Amino acid sequence: EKKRLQVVISEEQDALLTRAAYALSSPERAVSKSEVVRLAIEKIARELEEGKAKEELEALLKHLKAEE
Amino acid sequence: KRLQVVISEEQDALLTRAAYALSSPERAVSKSEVVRLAIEKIARELEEGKAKEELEALLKHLKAEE
C-alpha cells in the first residue's frame, strides 16, 4: 500500500527542498522533505494534466538535463 | 547527495504517468528527473507567492491521506 523511492539530487536541489519544507511548515503544521516531494509530484501532475505549463516545464527540463 | 522518499501508490502512479508524458522517443525522462523537476517547479511557485492556498489545500489532503 506504500511505494518507496530513491532519488539522487544536486546540492542546488537539496537546498531548494530544504527551503521549501521550511516555507510550507509552521508551528501548527510540520512539512518534511518527503512531504514536499509528494506535494511536488501532485502539483506537477496537475499542471501536466491541465496542459498550461508544459512549455516552461520543458525549458526547465532541458536545463536540468544539461546540468546532469 | 542521495535521498529516499516513501510515496503513495497513487503518487507513484502520478509520477509514472508524468515520466511518460514528459518523455519522447528522442528524450527519456526518468522518475528521478521528474522529481528534480517537480522540486524546482514548486520552489519557483513558492517564490512567486501564487497558489499558496492551492499548495496548502493539496498539502492538507495529502496529509489526511497519509
Q: DSSP of B19-61, one letter per residue? A: HHHH--SS----HHHHHHHHHHHHHHHHHHT-SHHHHHHHHHH
Q: Is residue A25 exposed (0-12), middle (13-18) or buried (19+ Cβ within 10 Å)?
A: middle
**Measured distance CA(B37)–CA(A41) in Å, rounded:** 9
Where in the sequence is the domain holding A11, given as residue range(s)? 1-68
* Domain count for chain B: 1
Look at A60 and B37 and tell me if their CB atoms are within 8 Å: yes
Identify the closest residue of chain B to A19 by CA–CA distance: B43
Contacts 24+ apart (CB under 8 A), A26-32: A29/B59, A29/B63, A31/B59
Closest CA to A47 of B8, B44, B26: B44
Experimental method: X-ray
Report the greatest alpha carbon distance in chain B: 39
How many Cβ pairs within 8 Å bridge chains A and B? 155
Kindly state the cell numbers that stand for A53: 505549463
Q: What are phi and psi of A5, to 5 degrees?
A: -135, 145
Nearest to residue A23, comparing CAs of A39, A11, A5, A10?
A39
Spatial separation of the C-alpha atoms in residues B66 and B50, rounded to whole Å: 25
Q: Compute the distance between CA of residue A46 and CA of residue A40 in angstroms, rounded to an integer.
A: 10
Residue A41 burial (CB < 10 Å; 0-12/13-18/19+)? buried
Sign of the C-alpha dihedral, residues B10, B15, B20, B22?
positive
- Which whole-number Å values give the CA distances from A6 to A27, A45, A53, B6, B12, in the listed order? 29, 19, 26, 9, 12
Specify the DSSP element, H or E, that contains A60: helix A54-67
The residue of A5, A28, A52 whose CB has the most chain B CBs within 10 angstroms, and thus the best one to mutate to test that interface, is A5
Residues belonging to chain B = 66
